[PDB]
Subunit: 194 residues, 2 copies
Amino acid sequence: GERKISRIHLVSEPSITHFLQVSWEKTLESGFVITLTDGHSAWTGTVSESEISQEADDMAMEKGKYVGELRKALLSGDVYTFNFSKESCYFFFEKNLKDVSFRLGSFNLEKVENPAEVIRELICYCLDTTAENQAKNEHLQLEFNQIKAEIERKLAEKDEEMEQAKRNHLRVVDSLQTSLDAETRSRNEALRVK
Amino acid sequence: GERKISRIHLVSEPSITHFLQVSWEKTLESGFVITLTDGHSAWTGTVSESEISQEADDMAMEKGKYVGELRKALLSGAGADVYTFNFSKESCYFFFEKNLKDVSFRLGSFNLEKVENPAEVIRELICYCLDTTAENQAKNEHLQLEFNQIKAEIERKLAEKDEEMEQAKRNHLRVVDSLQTSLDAETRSR
């Protein structure tokens, strides 16, 4: 399965950055696990297929159109506003539009009894991902740098081959002209003196 | 400045993955700040030049070899080269040892103050990881585009350098072709 970890700002405590971790099997449509966390506590809730469909029908929305809204709100870091209450453990979010805003979702998140465990796993995921990405960066840059040197290496030969051809062209002409000029002047004077 | 977030296992609590965050300004030799965390609590300590040298001389070690050892144990540089980590919550004492065949000796020891607000420390850490991943993917997109662009630019510039040559040669031949004739004629007549 896959996951995505975004950072969101709640209307409550806008000063503090919260982290939102959404994981799903093959698609959001099939259901997903969502985790809200600060540096100390963590709240996890499971959103099923039926609850996705039901909140879509309470909104009177097409199902794939609604799932698209979940993707844009929960998986990408303006347009969307996030809210969480610690007492009722209730996480809801809205979509603001040109002086208009509508309730897009509401899910209950059970407070995790072992937050540090979840947090450690998250950090592990982040460290692995950044490592792999940095591994990709190094690889493609080495190939880029190596090819860039191997590109202009062909120019170095190709330019010289021109300069070679170029001087050769000159030399041949230089002889021919002289071989022409000499043969004109010398004999024509021998015609003029005899 | 730079930093390195490493993953270590303490001899106490081997089941739990601990995180070690080392930050430095120029190089480790000039000093570094070190932070241990289990996702709940955080212990941070600052290590100056003088203490690095002092612990190096108490071990009777040269600095460049010892600073090199810090790089191996604290920044995930290893073979194999087995390092062992220990932390005490009582004395706030984090020490680590290097291991060899049937031998293990104290390699370092630092005092780490327990941070009163671990959550901020943890959040900053996660933000760093997320930011780095963002920047790296941006660099990846850029470098792949440049790669494709510089690659297409090879077969284009080469193809025309061929033409400019092939053309230049043709002109030359034509020029030569006349000169040669003007020689033969001028020989023949005379």
